[PDB]
């Protein structure tokens, strides 16, 4: 029989292929955050649309209703845990105000750049992909990793990295070798 | 063979059905037993859960009651004289559930020489003029093609008048 493991899509196409202002805004964001394609912009838009749809449906509902209370508390807790709302704007109306830069600010790439630790955002992307970064004693090499609130003070170099207290790489050791056989010949 | 389904019938509107299923063997219809008057001869047929029913093919005696008193006696069957379904069945002398037969009546008169508490009954006359010749009219009450036996009771009162009038 067919397998029982299912799957789903994460992006959606703009429906209007050659609109000038949207295209310019997309290039803005891609250049600012150092991304690869339009597909990443579209995945973030997809996620934000799901969030906003849930918030709208909850808001049209009656006050002191059990459904609203349960699901609104769950959604607000999830949002504040993600680091998108804060401390004094947890009221289910500030959900509708979340914009694209807010979500895009929580990527491990942006966080690695902003905390010193890298000279740019392209440097930040290349370091993550080369096994140099940890998030709390677990090594992460995926630049779309979204950092939660209580995990953002634990970003640091990895113990197995030459930038984090280990042996040097394949280039240093070969140069040192050539120097050794130079000085002992 | 014979089936008992309704897929070959017409609808109550008069339209005809399309068959898309074969016969299923849990609607068997096996052929009839034509029990006749003669020396005992009974066969065996097995039903679904290996439940046996007995096919009589020839019988000439049974157990017959006198309903007024509540007494039963084994006796001999002489003839068949009437059948309400069709009289082609008295012509071949076949025994079925609701036949009218004639039986030997000596065992019943002999038993009346114990004269249980029906001792003030005043036997009706027509039964006495029947007793004089030694034969009476009875009605079968069992199903010989299912139980293998032929049992019945003596006819009395208005039923006797009905069946006397039907036979003239």
């Amino acid at each position: 029989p067919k397998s029982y493991r299912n799957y789903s899509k994460t992006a959606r196409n703009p429906k209007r292929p050659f609109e000038k202002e949207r295209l310019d805004q997309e290039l803005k964001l891609i250049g600012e955050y150092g991304l690869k394609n339009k597909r990443e912009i579209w995945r973030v838009q997809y996620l934000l649309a799901k969030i906003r749809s849930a918030a709208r449906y909850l808001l049209t509902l009656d006050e002191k209703s059990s459904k609203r209370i349960f699901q609104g508390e769950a959604l607000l807790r999830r949002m504040v845990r993600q680091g998108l709302l804060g401390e004094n704007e947890e009221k289910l109306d500030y959900v509708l105000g979340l914009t694209l830069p807010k979500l895009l600010e929580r990527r491990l790439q942006t966080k690695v750049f902003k905390l010193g630790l890298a000279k740019s955002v392209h440097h930040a992307r290349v370091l993550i992909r080369q096994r140099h970064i940890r998030v709390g004693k677990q090594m992460v090499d995926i630049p779309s990793f979204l950092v939660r609130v209580d995990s953002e003070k634990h970003i640091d170099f990895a113990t197995t990295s030459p930038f984090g207290g280990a042996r040097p790489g394949r280039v240093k050791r070969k140069s040192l070798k050539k120097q050794k056989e130079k000085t002992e010949a | 063979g014979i089936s008992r389904d309704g897929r070959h019938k017409l609808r109550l509107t008069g339209g005809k059905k399309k068959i898309h299923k074969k016969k299923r063997k849990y609607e068997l219809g096996r052929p009839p037993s034509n029990t006749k008057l003669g020396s005992r001869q009974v066969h065996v047929v097995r039903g679904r859960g290996r439940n046996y029913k007995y096919r009589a093919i020839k019988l000439d005696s049974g157990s017959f009651s006198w309903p007024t008193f509540g007494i039963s006696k084994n006796t001999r069957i002489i003839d068949v004289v009437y059948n309400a379904s069709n009289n082609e069945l008295v012509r071949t002398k076949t025994l079925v559930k609701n036949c009218i037969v004639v039986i030997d009546s000596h065992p019943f008169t002999t038993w009346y020489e114990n004269t249980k508490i029906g001792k003030s009954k005043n036997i009706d006359p027509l039964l006495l003029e029947q007793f004089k010749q030694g034969r009476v009219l009875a009605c079968i009450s069992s199903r010989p093609g299912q139980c293998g036996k032929a049992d019945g009771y003596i006819i009395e009162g208005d039923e006797l008048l009905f069946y006397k009038r039907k036979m003239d």
């Binding site: 029989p1 029982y4 493991r5 059990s66 349960f70 | -």
Partner: protein, 257 residues
């Protein structure tokens, strides 16, 4: 052919067994016995998925080969035997005793009773028969025939049964103030008392039950089990004592670390 089926597929098994939808196309397919399939669990489920004593099916087999497991004071070697609601389970090698009950969800749990409580169970009557010679036989939910029943025992009430000898100890009536456990849809482990009985003439009968928190629910008459008189229950209960909270309050309680 078209005879009786012998296989059971995993996604078609009753949902309260809680089986993994990966790893297999089949489910154990309990045998025929004292309980219905949908109101019971096979012994392999109890002995591998719940108690975790076994890792595979063949290990359950090797456990049962050595006669160390008893249900209702009799050893059983069938890997798909049905166990059911009020039955007691004894394991000699570990010296353990259990009674199966519903929790506040719809799933079975082993309750870990003590040795003294392991000598009886509660059976509810389903019908009473009169047979040759004018003797009366009661039929219980357990699929069990009790001859020489007391004349005051009726169809819907429960009785307390000794296990060493199949005799009756006492019987508990079915009234307006009796204590009850409910055993089917939308409320499967709730314990309340009783408030009223309806008796609709040609159709089902509805009865109403009040919690100890003054919450009221209703169900059919056929899924009501009497477990005590007005004051106290006659068996020990799991830790919630059949008190069901709504999802908001349950979430609030769970948030204590």
């Amino acid at each position: 052919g078209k005879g009786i089926k012998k296989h059971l597929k995993r996604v078609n098994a009753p949902s309260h067994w809680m089986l993994n939808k990966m790893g297999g196309q089949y489910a154990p397919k309990t045998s025929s016995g004292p309980h219905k399939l949908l109101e019971s669990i096979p012994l392999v489920i109890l002995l591998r998925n719940r108690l975790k004593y076994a890792l595979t099916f063949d290990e359950v087999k090797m456990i049962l080969i050595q006669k160390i497991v008893k249900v209702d004071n009799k050893v059983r070697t069938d890997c798909t035997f049905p166990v059911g609601l009020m039955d007691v389970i004894h394991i000699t090698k570990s010296n353990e005793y259990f009674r199966l009950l519903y929790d506040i969800k719809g799933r079975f749990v082993p309750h870990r009773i003590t040795n003294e409580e392991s000598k009886y169970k509660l059976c509810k009557v389903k019908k009473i028969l009169l047979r040759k010679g004018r003797l009366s036989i009661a039929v219980t939910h357990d699929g069990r025939s009790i001859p020489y029943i007391h004349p005051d025992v009726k169809v819907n009430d429960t009785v307390r049964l000794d296990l060493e000898t199949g005799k009756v100890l006492e019987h508990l009536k079915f009234q307006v103030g009796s204590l009850v456990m409910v055993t089917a849809g939308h409320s499967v482990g709730r314990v309340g008392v009783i408030s009223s009985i309806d008796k609709n003439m040609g159709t089902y009968d509805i009865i109403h039950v009040k919690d100890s928190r003054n919450k009221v629910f209703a169900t059919r008459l056929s899924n009501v089990f009497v477990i005590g008189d007005n004051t106290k229950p006659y068996i020990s209960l799991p830790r919630e004592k059949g008190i069901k909270l709504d999802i908001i309050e349950e979430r609030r309680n769970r948030l204590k670390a």
